[PDB]
Design an enzyme around this catalytic site. Structure first.
Site, PDB file in Angstrom:
ATOM      1  N   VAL A 194      -5.267  -5.111  -4.408  1.00 45.51           N
ATOM      2  CA  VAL A 194      -5.127  -3.774  -4.451  1.00 45.51           C
ATOM      3  C   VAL A 194      -5.719  -3.172  -3.359  1.00 45.51           C
ATOM      4  O   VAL A 194      -6.827  -3.441  -2.607  1.00 45.51           O
ATOM      5  CB  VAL A 194      -5.982  -3.174  -5.837  1.00 45.51           C
ATOM      6  CG1 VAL A 194      -5.570  -1.592  -5.799  1.00 45.51           C
ATOM      7  CG2 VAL A 194      -5.653  -3.948  -6.817  1.00 45.51           C
ATOM      8  N   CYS A 195      -4.956  -2.037  -3.003  1.00 48.18           N
ATOM      9  CA  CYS A 195      -5.331  -1.164  -1.743  1.00 48.18           C
ATOM     10  C   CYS A 195      -6.584  -0.436  -1.973  1.00 48.18           C
ATOM     11  O   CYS A 195      -6.838   0.179  -2.748  1.00 48.18           O
ATOM     12  CB  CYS A 195      -4.210  -0.266  -1.353  1.00 48.18           C
ATOM     13  SG  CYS A 195      -2.431  -1.003  -1.066  1.00 48.18           S
ATOM     14  N   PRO A 196      -7.400  -0.603  -0.745  1.00 49.23           N
ATOM     15  CA  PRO A 196      -8.793   0.299  -0.937  1.00 49.23           C
ATOM     16  C   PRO A 196      -8.505   1.546  -0.968  1.00 49.23           C
ATOM     17  O   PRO A 196      -9.283   2.305  -1.740  1.00 49.23           O
ATOM     18  CB  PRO A 196      -9.361  -0.148   0.728  1.00 49.23           C
ATOM     19  CG  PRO A 196      -8.789  -1.664   0.873  1.00 49.23           C
ATOM     20  CD  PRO A 196      -7.719  -1.651   0.247  1.00 49.23           C
ATOM     21  N   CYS A 213       0.759  -1.143  -0.107  1.00 49.08           N
ATOM     22  CA  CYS A 213      -0.068   0.129  -0.099  1.00 49.08           C
ATOM     23  C   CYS A 213       0.816   1.500   0.059  1.00 49.08           C
ATOM     24  O   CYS A 213       1.565   1.584   0.809  1.00 49.08           O
ATOM     25  CB  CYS A 213      -0.863   0.066   1.212  1.00 49.08           C
ATOM     26  SG  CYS A 213      -2.230  -1.352   1.144  1.00 49.08           S
TER      27      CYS A 213
END
Lengths: 169, 178, 169, 178, 169, 178, 169, 178, 169, 178, 169
Positions: free
Chosen positions: I59-61, H173
């Site tokens: 995938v990142c929020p 992230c």
């Protein structure tokens, strides 16, 4: 293989730092210090071309002085002095802006940044830079003098004036 | 295309007119005025090689006098001066025997009669003779200076000496000379 | 391979020292002693061409004398004598100006300085100079006599006259 | 393209008519008038080689008499005279048997019947015969003199002798001869 | 490879000694004894061509006699006899002028001096001379008889007449 | 292009009709009239080789009678006569069995049925048959005589004998024969 | 490789001995017994072609008889019989003139003397002669039957008639 | 064509201006400001290679301050930062001696004076200088990140650090950074 | 070899899942969710192209959120965002239909199913899929930014916005 | 050009989604759902290989139920069923995790992500995906059955089973099945 | 390499035994049982092509029955059934005339006697005969189904009907 007597000097189109006192130029944009110079640019003049390896290496105060005193002498002989290294135009600018001797250099410094002129002239050496080479080029674009030196042998600008004089008689 | 800085000077092997007063040499045979000079003849010496187009052509009397007031300064610096043109050794002889200014010229004049050295150095011109060119070549046979001039611009021999001296000493300034 | 009987003599265009007494020529410029001579230059004449290796080598006083006495004899036979070596024109000049025998040589000396004529004629030798070779060339540009000698065998100019005579009858 | 100064004369191996009075030779067989002559036949001798176009053709009577008042002067100088044409050995014989001036010719006449020697020397002409040419070739088989003439200009044999003599002696002057 | 029956006889153009009694010819110039003979020269005639190796070799008196007696017989049959060797025309002349038998030889002797006819006909041998070869060539230029012999086998001229006769019938 | 003087006659290996009266040979098998004849069959003998175009064609009766009054003169001279045409051995047989003039022909008739020998000798013509040609070939297989005639000109066998004799004896004169 | 069914029979132009009783022909010249026969010569007829190796070899009286009796039968079927060997026409003549059985052979014998037809047909064998081969060629020049036999196997002429019949139906 | 993810970074051997305060280095000789840096000089380290077009050109003062507040974070991660342009080592020196923001730049500046590294990396542009490009290359010499920008868009050095960190740690992230 | 600054971005014509809330689209046919998108499709717009290896990977929020908040910011700058993987359009659909974060992705997802765009762009890697690469392409179709990352390094969408902004100034 | 009867099936080595209830597998790492499957993985078994164009596409619910009421009948016959498309292993997973009919699919799904197997089998079509094709390949890797259909014609899996059974048993009659 | 989906089915022109009850055909000539069938022959119809290795091998009574019952079903779908083996048309005839099951086969059997169709289709195998292969070819001449089986696996004609149906929908 250096270009010699009788050879056509190569065509060129290069960015250049303008000659003269940089503090005397106005300053509306950076581009004001700079210009394009091409081989088609003084029709009918002799050109005295100085190559050197690298900006920011020792030059003699006396050699730089000789350029200013001998300036009228070259102009009186319809000869345009041009300096060339493969440094960028901003390196040229920085060299002339920060070294008090170079402040008033009366001639333009061409940036042979793609190394095309040095290559075509035969002056690009094994380190990837122009050798210390002077050419005198007549109004027909013909070399009438070439001088090449290794290492850090100082230029004798008065001798190059002597030769130009003798060539024109 | 002249040979340039960093290039090997060409090998050669040429009949030369000996240096010095030709009137001092004993006339026992004609060949006493001549030797063969090869490119290995001067080990450990820098070679200062002057080409000119033709013998018997106007040379400024003070340039000659420089080649003989200065030849000592060159030797002191382990440098051997060698002159080269395309003329025969007999034309060199005749020039040095009857041009008074040349009567005492202290170095050899090589005869490049096959044109091989002028051609290999990049010096032979469109008229078939050597351009006016000077080379300084170091003891490893490497070119450290080349100068060429059109026409009948005379040589500044003292300038050549300066360059030779600056190459051996890392003097950076032309104005620190003499 | 020397050009022989039946062969076309090569074309040439060379600088030459003029024939005759050099002290009798005026002297407004150095170029006054000199001229260009080409193979197209006496239409309808025979040409007797002498090559030699090097200016400033021993020539017999008698051989040089024979040229002056036999001069009318060659001219009477519509034959133009021409000398050729690869020496420069200034070497030719210097040879004729300083050696009392050569002072009055009645014919021109061509400077085959690029060695093109000697090469094309087959006379350029292993030392890089023309062999001692005589050719007689008729008005159609055809060789009718060639003679080549090694070393330092003196020329017999009277024999070459004899041959020319016999060729014309 | 004639062979010239410094060239090797060609190798050869040709039937020759023997030199000398043919009336003195014993007629035991026809082959007594003939030998094979090779280019190694005369070691240590200079070879003076005369080509002519055709036997039976006008030769000035004093040129012949020179080849026989002079043949001794050539031998004294270690020189062997050899004549060459393209005619057969039988045409040479017939010429030397019935031309009175040739009855006593003291050297061999080579038959170059395959045209090989004339061709290799550069002497065979556009009519298929030898040009009038003289060579002097030294003991190392090297050409030191070549002379060629158009047409029916006769040879000056004494001139050839002079050149031979000057080549062996370093006489520099044509006028010092005889 | 000798040309054979059905083959075209080669074209030729050669100098020749004329046939007939040489003492009966006038003598305003040497060239009077001589002529050029070409393959185009008797249109509609047969040609009987004799090659031999060398002039001045033994020929039989009887063989030379046979030529004179059989002469009308060849002419009556529209046949032109021609002799060929590679000897020069002056050798031919000298042979016919000095050997009493040959004095009245009624036909021309061609000088195949460049050896082109002998070569083209296949008769030039390993010694460099024509073999002893007879050809009979018809008016269409076609060979109808060839005979070749080694060494010194005498010619039978009567046999060649016999063949010509039989060919024409 | 006929093979000529100095050429090697071609190698061959052909069925032949035997020479001599065929009525004298015992009829034990058909193959008794025939042999294989090779080019090595006659060592030390000269070979007189006659080609003709076709069997069964007009041959002058006195030419045949010459090949049999003369065959002895040939043998005396170590010569072997061999006839050649392109016909088969069976056509030769039939010709020699039923043409009376040929009933006693004393030499072999070779069948060149593949046309290989006629072709190699240069004798096969534009109609596909042998030209009328004679060769004399010496004991070293070298051609010393070749004669060829157009059409239907008959052979003079005595002339061939003369040549054979002159080749072996160095008789120079055709008129010294018989 | 023998030509087969569907193949075009080769073109030919050959000298031939005429068919029929030779004693019944007049005799103004030898050429009267002879003729040229070409492949263009009976437009619209079938051709029955017999090859054999060599004239003068044993043939059966019965086989020759069969040709005479079956002659009308071939003609009635628009079929022209032709014999071919590589023998010369004079060999053919001699064979038919001297062997009583062959005297009345009703068809022509072609002389394939250059061996071109035998070659083109695929019948020329390793001995250099035609194999014993029969072809039946239709009016379009197309082979509809081929038969080839080694050695000395007699021909069955009645069988070849049978085949022709069946081909035409 | 830039080199990309998975490609070997090119070998190199270039004169570099040393990192750090140039005022702290003892001025015993000029060459004390310079070393040769080869591609094997940093074993076990990730190499973060920044190219720029020309020295003496506007660089945002906070980007520089990032290259020196951040250089520690790179070292902590066994990463060596190396700067590259086509300028000579003497132009680098002059830039780092007289641009105040660069007086303390802690990493070496390579001189790519022959243009060989820019060319091999796919970075040399149509004006003859390096495009503004960043590479991250792992200890096995493999490219794991390449970023290129037109013009005079400045670098976000903290982003490069993030990527370096994510490559070594498998953070998925971008928002988990700082 | 990745395409770089100054390079023309490749032409393409690919099936794409439309951008935006999929539950808000009507549904008369499956094809309603889908569209063709070509390189000729917004003349005068910037294109920001995102490649990734495989649909259905983490995938990142926050990264997906950043797309929705930054959407106006890209549109305000005449920039069209486009996503590309080699997955089929039905994989794209399924990914966006089943993962709550992806439900409202505002831009189209191209299916580079023949792998032609990835190949032509230099992004197709050794596993057979596109690397994680962002390009910014100007209205002249010229690349002004490329960024490529190994492994599973998250995208910083705000940084790509920053660059676009700085490129346009 | 499809591979056909008698051809060797291509070698392969592909990531596969494991067969069976994915809910039964322990979620210790993601890679637990996947293996590498090579063409040597099933020695001694017939391989029944089904290609389809794209995951997530309409498949008739009874065809799926056939692949799982029938998978036992295939195993009983030493046959291994393998599914292949060009989708990634992650698309297979997602299809088998969220399409209810596929939740229990008992065989592996190969990911032909480089397209290499589809291409080598002759199955990749002009849209870049696998045609709907079935192969039966024997234990010696030889193709004994291939079937291909345009469009969205569904497979009759029981027919494939019949063919498999007829290949192993030499049943000649389609009507003797079930 | 078998031709597949999307491929053009090869052109053909072959002799065929007609379909249907052979005892119901009149019989004025043998040729009455036979016909030429070409690929241009039902414009706008589907063609269902069955290849098999060899006539006279076991076929299931049930499989032959299925052809008769399913005949209307293929015709109703504008589909022309065609059988192909490399057997001759007389083998086809003999097979259908002597095997009671085959008596009423409603479709034509093509004789691919030069093996050109089997070759061009990719069905000719290593034994030299067609594999057991079914093709369904649409009205554009495009293959939409191919099925190939080794050995002696019976055909399921109902399945091929199912596929045709599904292809047309």
């Amino acid at each position: 293989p250096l270009l010699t007597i009788g050879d056509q000097f190569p065509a060129y189109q290069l960015t250049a730092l303008i000659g003269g006192d940089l503090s005397k130029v106005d300053a509306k944009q950076p581009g004001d210090y700079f210009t394009t110079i091409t081989s088609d640019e003084h029709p009918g003049k002799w050109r005295v071309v100085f190559f050197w390896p690298k900006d920011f290496t020792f030059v003699c105060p006396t050699e730089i002085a000789a350029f200013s005193k001998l300036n009228d002498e070259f102009e009186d002989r319809d000869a345009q002095i041009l300096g060339v290294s493969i440094d960028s135009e901003f390196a040229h600018f920085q060299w002339r802006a920060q070294h008090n001797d170079l402040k008033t250099l009366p001639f333009p410094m061409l940036s042979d940044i793609k190394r095309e002129l040095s290559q075509a002239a035969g002056v690009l050496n094994a380190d990837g830079v122009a050798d210390r080479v002077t050419f005198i080029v007549d109004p027909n674009n013909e070399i009438q003098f070439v001088s090449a030196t290794a290492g850090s042998v100082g230029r004798n600008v008065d001798e190059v004036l002597r030769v130009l004089d003798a060539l024109q008689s």
